[PDB]
């Protein structure tokens, strides 16, 4: 059970060895098309590439792009993890949301962190200043933006110019994380999660919702492991049953090094258990989670 095991850990403050033990059992496969000489400038990361067996394939040509699919067959949810696009690959990004059916996009890092570009600016700011990705023959409309104390939902449409067809794509842009770092609170974790869920964008009607950070894999680890863990807890209705670092490992044979540091592997584990709460019936705890959150300040 996660409070227990949680509590022993803190207690003998062994979050480092516990996550190193992941480190070692993780999965180890192939990444021979990420590392093909043609796709060197499709990658932002030299350390960090989709497996073979589990990359999104776009319907192009050149099919490569940095995105993995983790489909927890368990959880009867899939999740689409992928490394912020770069300058070149913004119209690939798009192609494969569009490919995928992808309704939501959940993006946890900022443009510009502690000094660098960790993120091409891939969606527009501006109404009036729609973007056409030329290679991929798609146009991208602002449609209109929520914007909270430390996060911020846009409608977006997305546009295939070569049908017409349109669809509405919900953006879901968390500003406050630090790369290698955690959120602010689990309240303000949980308190996005829980709009994230209830825009309909993870509905197994529509594609896989669309992860990203900079990387894809630590931030982005992070959310898909707390969704995932409180989704088969929700299931059961019986949060003993699940063991979070054997979802974690599941997750990992599908994108490496998902989860980058000890203590984002401790929040998941707080964001699992206060999660609970709601999951076990206590739907109050929600607006809790709103308040403490303070996403309605400035
Ligand atoms: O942009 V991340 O370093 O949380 O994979």
Same mark, same amino acid.
């Given at each position: 059970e996660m409070?227990?095991?949680?509590?022993?850990?803190?207690?003998?403050?062994?979050?480092?060895?516990?996550?190193?033990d992941?480190?070692h059992?993780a999965?180890?496969?192939?990444?021979?098309?990420?590392?093909l000489?043609?796709?060197?400038?499709?990658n932002?990361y030299?350390?960090v590439?989709?497996?073979d067996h589990?990359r999104i394939?776009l319907?192009?040509?050149?099919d490569?792009?940095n995105?993995?699919?983790?489909?927890?067959?368990?959880?009867?949810?899939?999740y689409?993890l992928?490394?912020?696009?770069?300058?070149?690959?913004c119209?690939?990004?798009?192609?494969?949301?569009?490919?995928?059916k992808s309704?939501?996009?959940?993006?946890?890092?900022?443009?510009?962190?502690?000094?660098?570009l960790?993120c091409?600016?891939?969606?527009?700011? @501006?109404?009036?200043? $729609? %973007?056409?990705?030329?290679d991929t023959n !798609?146009?991208? /409309?602002?449609?209109?933006?929520?914007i909270?104390?430390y996060?911020?939902?846009?409608?977006?449409?997305?546009?295939?110019?070569?049908?017409?067809?349109?669809?509405?794509?919900?953006?879901f842009?968390?500003?406050?994380?630090?790369?290698?770092?955690?959120?602010e609170?689990?309240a303000?974790?949980?308190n996005?999660?829980?709009?994230?869920?209830?825009?309909g964008?993870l509905?197994?009607?529509?594609?896989?919702?669309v992860?990203?950070?900079?990387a894809?894999?630590?931030?982005?680890?992070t959310?898909c492991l707390?969704?995932?863990?409180?989704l088969?807890?929700?299931?059961?209705?019986?949060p003993s049953?699940?063991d979070?670092? @054997?979802?974690?490992? $599941? %997750?990992?044979?599908?994108?490496?090094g !998902?989860?980058? /540091?000890?203590?984002?592997?401790?929040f998941?584990?707080?964001?699992?258990?206060?999660?609970?709460?709601?999951?076990?019936?206590?739907?109050?705890?929600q607006?809790?989670?709103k308040?403490?959150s303070?996403?309605?300040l400035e």
């Open positions: 409070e227990k095991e949680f509590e022993q850990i803190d207690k003998s403050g062994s979050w480092a060895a516990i996550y190193q992941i480190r059992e999965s180890d496969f192939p990444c021979r098309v990420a590392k000489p043609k796709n060197k400038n499709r932002r030299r350390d590439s989709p497996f589990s394939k319907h192009q040509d050149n490569y792009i995105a993995s699919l983790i489909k927890m067959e368990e959880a009867q949810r899939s689409i992928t490394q912020g696009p770069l300058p070149n690959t119209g690939h990004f798009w192609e494969m949301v569009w490919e995928q309704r939501g996009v959940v993006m946890l890092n900022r443009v510009m962190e502690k000094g660098s960790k091409a600016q891939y969606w527009p700011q @501006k109404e009036e200043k $729609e %973007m056409i990705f030329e !798609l146009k991208l /409309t602002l449609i209109s933006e929520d909270k104390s996060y911020t939902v846009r409608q977006l449409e997305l546009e295939n110019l070569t049908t017409q067809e349109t669809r509405e794509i919900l953006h842009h968390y500003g406050t994380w630090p790369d290698f770092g955690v959120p609170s689990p303000s974790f949980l996005f999660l829980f709009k994230v869920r209830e825009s964008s509905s197994p009607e529509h594609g896989p919702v992860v990203h950070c900079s894809g894999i630590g931030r982005s680890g959310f707390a969704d995932t863990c409180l088969l807890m929700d299931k059961r209705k019986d049953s699940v979070i670092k @054997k979802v974690l490992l $599941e %997750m990992r044979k599908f994108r490496m !998902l989860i980058q /540091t000890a203590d984002q592997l401790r998941s584990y707080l964001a699992v258990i206060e999660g609970a709460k709601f999951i076990m019936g206590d739907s109050s705890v607006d809790q989670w308040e403490l303070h996403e309605d």
